[PDB]
Amino acid sequence: AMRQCAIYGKGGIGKSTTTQNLVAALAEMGKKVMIVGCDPKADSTRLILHSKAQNTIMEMAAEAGTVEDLELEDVLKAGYGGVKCVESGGPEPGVGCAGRGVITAINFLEEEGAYEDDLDFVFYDVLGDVVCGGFAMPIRENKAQEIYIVCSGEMMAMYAANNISKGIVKYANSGSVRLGGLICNSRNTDREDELIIALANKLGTQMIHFVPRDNVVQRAEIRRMTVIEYDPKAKQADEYRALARKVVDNKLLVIPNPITMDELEELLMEFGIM
Amino acid sequence: AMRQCAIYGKGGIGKSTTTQNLVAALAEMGKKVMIVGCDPKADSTRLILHSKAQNTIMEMAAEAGTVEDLELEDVLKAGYGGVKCVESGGPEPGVGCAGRGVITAINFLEEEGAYEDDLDFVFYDVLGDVVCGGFAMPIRENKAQEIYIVCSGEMMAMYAANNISKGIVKYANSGSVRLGGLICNSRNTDREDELIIALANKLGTQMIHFVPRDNVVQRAEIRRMTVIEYDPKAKQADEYRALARKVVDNKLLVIPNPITMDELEELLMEFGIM
Amino acid sequence: MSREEVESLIQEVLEVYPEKARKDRNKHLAVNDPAVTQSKKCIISNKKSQPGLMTIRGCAYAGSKGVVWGPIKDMIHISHGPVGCGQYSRAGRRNYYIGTTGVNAFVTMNFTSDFQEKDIVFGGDKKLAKLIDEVETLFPLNKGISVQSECPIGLIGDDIESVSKVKGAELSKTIVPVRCEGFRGVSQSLGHHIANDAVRDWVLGKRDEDTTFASTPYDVAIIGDYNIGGDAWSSRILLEEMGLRCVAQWSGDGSISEIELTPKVKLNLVHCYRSMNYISRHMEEKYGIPWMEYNFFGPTKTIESLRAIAAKFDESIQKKCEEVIAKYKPEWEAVVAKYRPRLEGKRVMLYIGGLRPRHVIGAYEDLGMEVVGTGYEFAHNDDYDRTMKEMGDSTLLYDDVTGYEFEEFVKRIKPDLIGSGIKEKFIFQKMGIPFREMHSWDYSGPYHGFDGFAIFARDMDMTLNNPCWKKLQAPWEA
Amino acid sequence: SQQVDKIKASYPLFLDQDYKDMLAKKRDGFEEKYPQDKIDEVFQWTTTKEYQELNFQREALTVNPAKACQPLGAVLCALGFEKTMPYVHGSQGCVAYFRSYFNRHFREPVSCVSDSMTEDAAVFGGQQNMKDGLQNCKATYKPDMIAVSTTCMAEVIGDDLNAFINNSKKEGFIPDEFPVPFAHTPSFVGSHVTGWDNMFEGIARYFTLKSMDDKVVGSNKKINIVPGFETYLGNFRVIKRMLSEMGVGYSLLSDPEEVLDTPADGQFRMYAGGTTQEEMKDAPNALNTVLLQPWHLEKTKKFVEGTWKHEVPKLNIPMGLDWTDEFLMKVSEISGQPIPASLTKERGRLVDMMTDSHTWLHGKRFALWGDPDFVMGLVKFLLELGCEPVHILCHNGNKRWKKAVDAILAASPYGKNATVYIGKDLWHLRSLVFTDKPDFMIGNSYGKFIQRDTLHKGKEFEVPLIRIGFPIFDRHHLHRSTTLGYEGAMQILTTLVNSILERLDEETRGMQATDYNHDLVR
Ligand SMILES: Nc1ncnc2c1ncn2[C@@H]1O[C@H](COP(=O)(O)OP(=O)(O)O)[C@@H](O)[C@H]1O
Ligand SMILES: Nc1ncnc2c1ncn2[C@@H]1O[C@H](COP(=O)(O)OP(=O)(O)O)[C@@H](O)[C@H]1O
Ligand code: ICS
Ligand code: CLF
Ligand code: SF4
Ligand code: ALF
Ligand code: ALF
Ligand SMILES: [Fe+3]
Ligand SMILES: [Mg+2]
Ligand SMILES: [Mg+2]
């Protein structure tokens, strides 16, 4: 049991918001979920905890000497739907090493048995710019077995998704992690469905769901809540419920086959006009 | 002459696209500019060179021994309108250490004299997730003088801009680097301009030329060029001309006074509702 | 002298520090009082070093590669990262071994990946795999490969575990990844812990489903003895002279086969509690093997420990132990009768890593020498708890002492002899105080057992009573 | 057992019968080692040419490197300044290792501090570490200057030394005018000599870069001497003596000879001598700057030519006859002083020793390694003596240095059988001395193991080691020797010829077998 998934994608493509709304919909379906935020910004758990995470692994480790003098209950907290939430800390921008922060946080969670429960889903929300091995820590062996990439129809996000696929390939071969599929967070440029499904087909994966872009998400996040908790009768809430159900029953698990820059630009020139 | 600017902001907020369009606008005004991409994704010079910059400092250095064996002409290449383009290299995602690569590339540019005379602008397009000191290499002493933070009305974008300001504070006090202003990329949010203006006032800065969201940008960039090359008479091209003009005539250079999470939430309730 | 004066000395020494550093360092200096039940109220340890204070501590790489893994003879230990760490650690520690270096033994060799800038920027996993292949091609008689991580490996998230697994499966070799990057922990102690965990996870369980080893009831394994100057050997000859079968030695003159055979033994004799108590507890709670701390420093401790170990076996082992004691009695008695008059009443201050600051006090007292000051680089609370029962009344105790602190303590106390490492030796030799290297035995030894005791007494007399110490002041000066 | 009259240390304690029996029983019962025949076969294979081909095809594995990391050289450079504390930003294990290395080489105290960056400092940056470390070091050891280098961790995470030190100054941890020169010294770039160059460039630009306006070249009528990474105290002493005999005003920047040669008189001196800050401030006023070891002072050369505007001469290291002559003539042409009669007589005495010893020196084949400038000087001097430097290895050498040494070898008939290797470690050299055996090898203490290996192939294959270079751990007080100048050439010649003569005496000591050539007069 206990599927472990890692959320990757382009920076600012909506990985944190989408994963938090997905986890809220999952807890709505009676699923015990855990969220690990592998981002130096402790922003992966603002909606679920209804506040900024004030107890990160790195902060509590520095405030108590070393990480070997830390305990699970100091950093692990529960929010909406009983979702247990822990956040990897990290430096303020432009200093330190956030990759090492993520490495230390994941090693602490593993050593302390942060997962040994009646858990059905563990989601690692990673940042956009995977620039070192530490931010690939969630997809190592005995870690997240599925990867979901969040993308959109502007070609920079598509090139990003191709680059994360290139990076993913080495851990897919070295281990058992697999690309479950692509989540499309809408930007509504010209032809988002066609472009994203074509990119997914080229990579050998599916487009598990399409999430529209509406302002109820922003309005809900202003109140520090997920759409599911804010407006359960909203269309976006049902979209997140559909995405959750499609995640639960998903079975496609493929090693990605990234395309070259020339093939990617050919795909854009072919599926990206009118 | 010789104005050194560093483009930062939330991931995927449009730093590279806006930077390239602004650089095209500045070069059409007879100003000699050079773009340094400090992202392991060497995607910050594509719309200027009309192709992906295959040769990067890190890749060339690894192929040709070390960085000392390299030459500027092999990495510094001209493009549309006399815009010199160079890119720091980097590993594929999830491996290595891209911040060290950015440090080494920028040191190589400094040591090789890329910062010659008759160069009005040097723009460092940095990635959105400044995870280490390496990606703060552009704002080191005597490297970049002005910082432009691209933001939007989203809560996450404003939080990222405030976090980046918090990271900037140490370099601003250490050296002479300041925050020129907040370029706004429209995301079509409720009271977007109001939110950006209020956040800029709280930081002690201004919002420089809120940029509208238009698909002419998507089209131009999918045709491997800036909007200026594509449709000079388009509305967004004139907007980029206005942005370039407002950048040239800017004198508000301040050390940001970043606001806490509580003050950020108060800002969101005050200007992010209705 | 006197509990009050040494406290005043501590305060005067601490006076020069900034308030933060003074507040921190006050808790690491104490005056011994056996009226204390828990060292937590007395002295705290195993904490971060104060920056810029010139500490003596090493790193986790030193505690793992330099201390635990390095002494293993038939394994090749690769300092993964830049060139510095392995080069400075190459053959600096005299963990003695028998073998053919470069053919089937590699202890004094320095294997490294020699990271360049491109290895940092683009990762070193492929380079690590190629290095493992080259190690196989050029050293085909090695019986194991360990990858000791340096600081950049820990920083950049190189997946050395994946490389170790894949290459070990491909080559039928034990490849042990040790995440001993130097910035982890505060000292070599976390290096000990990480190395012990690596041994437990990758080596100790290889022969779990194996019963082809004949086991006798008298099987003991020496744990935490690193054969400095042959120490372990000098210890081993005693145990096997009282009937015991020494199946394993950890890890000085150690082979990976002995470590794999350790779970088959019946007793675990731990010399250095600090470095290898982790694996001793693991084996006690998994295989049911009891472990006992012993001490082979000086005749008194050696006899006491031999009788304590014998009491854990049959009557035959006890008779053999008694005959060993009676046989070796005249030799150490002659050593005492020769060297104690030369050393009686001489005061010694010690500063060593984590076991020897308290373990060698009995040996010094066997020669009439009093230990007035002692301290540890990286010991824990339990080590100081054990230290209290061994130190005399109103004796100075220090933890992670700085160069300034230790220099001032020596200036005020004025001991006859100082036992510490290479980084204090010449400082205190220039102050005119005889110095003995208590890590390397000053390139002498062994100091364990009765032969070791003879050597130890000879060295103490040789340095303490050397004529050079009477020539420090020029005759044309007051 | 021990006899109280004659106490045996480990050798020869463990040659006793009971210890030998114990070792044999332990090996038989629990070690499960390869058969002695298998071990002999593998050793013989490792001494072969096919093994050398496999060895030289290595791309990823380094075995027994002949080099160290940059911060070691940075610490050595910083030690050569007056009341200066070396301060390494990063992890403390590095500082412990640097201190132990230099302690074992010099047999002297070596002062150096760390800011003790732990995992939390790695993740969050060591700015707090820098502030507290600078304050603590200044308050505890009262240096007149703290010279800051880096370990690998601080270089990987991009710890901005400039920003950290500036913030420490503005927040009142250290006085604003307290000199804190800094240099980034990544251990994964270059070697220890690169660290020396980087530290010296940082110290130079700290004291000179911002105050060049009131500087005029030659106004002090002195000569700047940059020694580079130097671990022979006699080298500093000989450069000083030769310049002062010449009547030349000089300023030797980074002079560590006093702090590494303090007397034992009941006092410990943490600082002693060293280049004063006023010397570095006045350095741009010098007539010129001469780099003693230019091949690892490239950054210093660029800075001195581009900032101080000194036309740095193209001088090789002043090692051996020709290059000492060139150094003296260049110093003369710069300062205007003539070469005095004492120096001419010293040169003539060097030539006399050369003529006295040429018969034993001529034709001798050598394997040598070390730093590039020292190695090149040794090669040149060996060519001057009629020796053949067959195996010239420099782990931290580069292509341009290799080309220069190849051109030097081509200019002499004794460089015909010589090959220069760069990026090769001492395992490569072990193979080289097995497959193309030289008469001797010259290098640091690590070469002793190679000698051991050669002796295992037989006494006729044994290549004796001559200990010149760094580090030298198994001999005492060799750091006091000299290798530069005529005096250094004389010491090297004496060592070489007497090593040859002692080897020949050993090979002819067998009575009635080889003692017919055991001559009293050589
Ligand atoms: N379906 C969506 N509809 C509208 N806005 C969205 C949607 N998804 C994300 N966003 C908005 O865009 C911003 C993306 O920020 P974030 O979720 O943190 O991305 P990431 O974690 O990948 O960096 C959010 O603030 C959110 O307001
Ligand atoms: N004014 C704009 N109008 C339309 N699209 C934009 C605009 N600015 C940026 N984008 C689009 O948003 C996406 C963000 O990609 P990018 O510019 O590379 O962001 P970043 O450099 O911050 O990572 C791009 O595909 C780009 O086409
Ligand atoms: S392992 Fe430890 S510092 Fe127990 S790291 Fe250190 S060869 Fe010391 S006091 Mo060097 S805990 Fe051994 C030691 Fe003691 S290297 Fe040796 S002498 S008995
Ligand atoms: S605390 Fe320990 S010894 Fe230090 S680096 Fe870290 S593992 Fe190693 Fe290594 S190459 Fe030189 S000595 Fe360092 S600066 Fe890096
Ligand atoms: S790129 Fe990653 S590993 Fe390298 S310094 Fe930045 S956060 Fe650390
Ligand atoms: F804030 Al992001 F990917 F840009 F989590
Ligand atoms: F995703 Al980016 F700069 F390329 F934030
Ligand atoms: Fe000395
Ligand atoms: Mg996120
Ligand atoms: Mg960009």
Numbering used by the authors:
A (entry chain F), B (entry chain E): 1 to 274
C (entry chain A): 4 to 481
D (entry chain B): 2 to 523
How do the authors describe this structure?
Nitrogenase catalyzes the ATP-dependent reduction of atmospheric dinitrogen to ammonia through the reaction shown in Equation 12. The Fe- and MoFe-proteins are both inactivated upon exposure to oxygen, with the Fe-protein being the more sensitive of the two4.
